[PDB]
Design a protein around this ligand. Structure first.
Ligand code: CL
Lengths: 9, 562
């Protein structure tokens, strides 16, 4: 649902 | 050659599921797990995915494959255009994992966990400011939120949310104009606001609404799920779910040894090896994801919730921002390391939201060293014959690049761009001489005002399930960690979600202008669109990557043991 910081994949 | 979105979306196992038993899931993270069960206080996608069996940080509404709201979930939502209101109705038998009732106050408390600055949430946005009286509550001018009311009282199951202006995306999940989670007030009321994020009651021993509950949480490592007896819906098939973090280096070996049945969010560079693994079916689909390059353009005012583009830097010039983007060799990097899974991006809106993408939008997908040099030339940065770097006023064009840890090619790719910026005469060095760890990176970007020790970084997003990007770039949002503030860009963002954009033909044109303006202003530079793949063990029954599948965790099972 909401935006989230991802590791890089 | 780039691979088409022709991956199998679901693994349809002919084998019948058993009772239970024990499923083993992992998420690829080189950083320790960040256990936070309240949606408002959690910033990473890593734990949001790991909280799935527990309810996805207690999600309320059900969804079709296009992320649009449908009835039948933990709660239902209904919109009224003329009154500008949303009505949320929780199920009568919706309960926490301790047996207590989920009430209207629980939903309102979620708004307090973000709006009330004493909890220390990074999720404040201009979108939330559209709720009547929320801005006044956020600044402390009011004691409560006037736009949120309870028709059946705080004990009731009904909540009303008053808006200033109606927004198009309100029929779709991830709109951000109203929230979709609940928090256990009674359980958390005696905990001081500033202590809530680090409390064991929101980390290691929480209360959930989903089909599974955390029986044990090993801080920074794993979750032990068991069936939740107070779950409103279908009884789960499995006895237990173990959800663990797994390092990039150990992921493929963990698949070969059958340690995990499923690994989510694996890097593109490992697909080469994953596809050769028998006993696993590789599912896939278009990632709701974008990676892009950020510039540090100012700071964030926390007291007044506003991004101020006031950083003294050569990156304040438009020609400098564009050239650095044109210098990059994203295409060459993609064709060499990504196994045909990464496509260089032309704009900020991913192919997944196909309706609002346009091939007309030319961006930075193709390297142009000549144009980069020219743009820098006609701007005032003249190349020094001695040093090999451009100068202005005797000030050398030297920038700091905060590159990030990733796969085995992360250090290579980072240096790859450095050499490209070298070719155009821009001196670029790594932050503290080494790649940045994910957890400490997030803290460095989100914490106000803040950092002045970086110029270029890379942002990777698990984007909102709704195409609008207000929660990424709007002036009030901390998530805008480059800290830009542009009248035209703001207007573009607002026009995308205006009253006129209820008309989809008008909203299409608003997205096109936005994408062309963001590429032109070059505050951020779109890097990659990705295609996601998931290795699933052949014993797993009822597994799917379909966004419309709601009872996934309840219907999922196994055909055999270890
Ligand atoms: Cl207000």
């Amino acid at each position: 649902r909401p935006p989230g910081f991802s590791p890089f994949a | 050659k780039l691979k088409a979105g022709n991956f199998d979306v679901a693994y349809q196992n002919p084998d019948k599921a058993i009772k239970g038993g024990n499923l083993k899931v992992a998420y690829q993270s080189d950083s320790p797990m960040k256990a936070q069960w309240l949606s408002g206080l959690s910033n990473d996608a890593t734990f949001a995915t790991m909280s799935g069996p527990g309810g996805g940080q207690d999600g309320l509404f059900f969804t079709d494959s296009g992320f649009k709201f449908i009835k039948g979930g933990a709660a239902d939502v209904a919109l009224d255009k003329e009154s500008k209101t949303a009505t949320i109705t929780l199920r009568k038998d919706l309960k926490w994992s301790d047996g207590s009732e989920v009430t209207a106050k629980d939903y309102e408390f979620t708004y307090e966990t973000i709006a009330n600055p004493a909890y220390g949430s990074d999720r404040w946005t201009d979108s939330l400011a559209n709720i009547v009286g929320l801005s006044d509550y956020h600044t402390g001018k009011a004691k409560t939120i006037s736009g949120i009311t309870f028709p059946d009282g705080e004990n009731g199951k009904v909540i009303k949310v008053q808006f200033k202006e109606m927004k198009p995306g309100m029929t779709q999940s991830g709109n951000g104009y109203f929230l979709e989670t609940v928090a256990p007030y009674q359980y958390l009321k005696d905990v001081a606001p500033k202590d809530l994020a680090s409390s064991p009651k929101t980390t290691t021993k929480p209360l959930v609404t989903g089909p599974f509950k955390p029986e044990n949480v090993v801080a920074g490592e794993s979750i032990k799920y068991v069936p939740n007896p107070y779950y409103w819906g279908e009884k789960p098939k499995l006895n237990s779910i173990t959800y663990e973090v797994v390092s990039t280096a150990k992921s493929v070996a963990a698949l070969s040894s059958s340690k995990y049945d499923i690994i989510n969010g694996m890097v593109s560079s490992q697909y080469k090896q994953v596809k050769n693994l028998k006993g696993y079916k590789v599912l896939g689909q278009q990632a709701m994801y974008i990676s892009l390059m950020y510039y540090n353009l100012g700071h964030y005012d926390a007291k007044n919730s506003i991004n101020v583009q006031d950083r003294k830097t050569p990156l304040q010039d438009q020609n400098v921002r564009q050239a650095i983007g044109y210098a990059r060799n994203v295409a060459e990097v993609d064709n060499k390391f990504s196994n045909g899974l990464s496509t260089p991006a032309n704009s900020l809106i991913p192919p997944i939201f196909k309706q609002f993408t346009s091939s007309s939008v030319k961006g930075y997908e193709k390297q142009d060293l000549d144009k980069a040099n020219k743009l820098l030339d006609e701007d005032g940065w003249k190349l020094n014959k001695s040093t090999g770097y451009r100068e202005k006023d005797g000030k050398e064009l030297s920038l700091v690049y905060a590159a990030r840890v990733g796969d085995a090619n992360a250090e290579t790719i980072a240096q790859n761009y450095i050499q490209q910026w070298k070719k155009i005469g821009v001196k670029v060095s790594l932050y503290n001489g080494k790649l940045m760890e994910f957890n400490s990176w997030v803290d460095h970007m989100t914490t106000p005002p803040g950092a002045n020790d970086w110029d270029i970084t890379d942002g990777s997003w698990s984007l909102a399930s709704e195409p609008s990007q207000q929660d990424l770039f709007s002036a009030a949002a901390p998530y805008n960690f480059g800290h830009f503030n542009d009248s035209e860009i703001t207007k573009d963002l607002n026009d995308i979600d205006s009253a006129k954009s209820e008309n989809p033909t008008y909203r299409k044109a608003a997205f096109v202008k936005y994408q062309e303006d963001m590429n032109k202003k070059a505050y951020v530079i779109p890097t990659n669109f990705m295609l996601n793949y998931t290795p699933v063990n052949k014993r797993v029954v009822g597994m799917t990557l379909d966004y419309g599948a709601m009872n996934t965790w309840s219907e999922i099972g196994v055909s055999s043991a270890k």
